[PDB]
Amino acid sequence: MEKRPRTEFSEEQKKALDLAFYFDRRLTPEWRRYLSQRLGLNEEQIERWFRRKEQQIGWSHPQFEK
Amino acid sequence: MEKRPRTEFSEEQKKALDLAFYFDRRLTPEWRRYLSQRLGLNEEQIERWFRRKEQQIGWSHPQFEK
Structure with missing residues (x-):
């Protein structure tokens, strides 16, 4: 998984959304x-x-890179 | 420009950092x-x-996608 292949937000993308939150x-x-x-x-x-x-895990958002 | 070739944050990356700010x-x-x-x-x-x-442009940050 490196790029997003079929509009599914791959790892490269997941990062970005975690910056916004x-x-x-x-x-x-x-x-x-x-x-x-x-x-x-x-x-x-x-x-x-x-x-x-x-x-x-319950909505507390302890996952950032996970 | 689609991926980052030499650690320079290409467009795909620039987006992510704009989400954090x-x-x-x-x-x-x-x-x-x-x-x-x-x-x-x-x-x-x-x-x-x-x-x-x-x-x-003067530090007011009016640029998001620019």
């Missing part, structure tokens, strides 16, 4: 599509990354 | 090297991205 007005209806433009996947995969980032 | 404790001595690990370039290029992001 909603702090710069990201992950909102106007910044999900913002990322999509040069990120490569759609807002759906943004919201899937978003919840799978925290919900993996 | 220091908001998630990024761009600090412990998160510059954090990014570097899977970002591909060193903390030097983080600080160069950082200042070149805002200083391009």
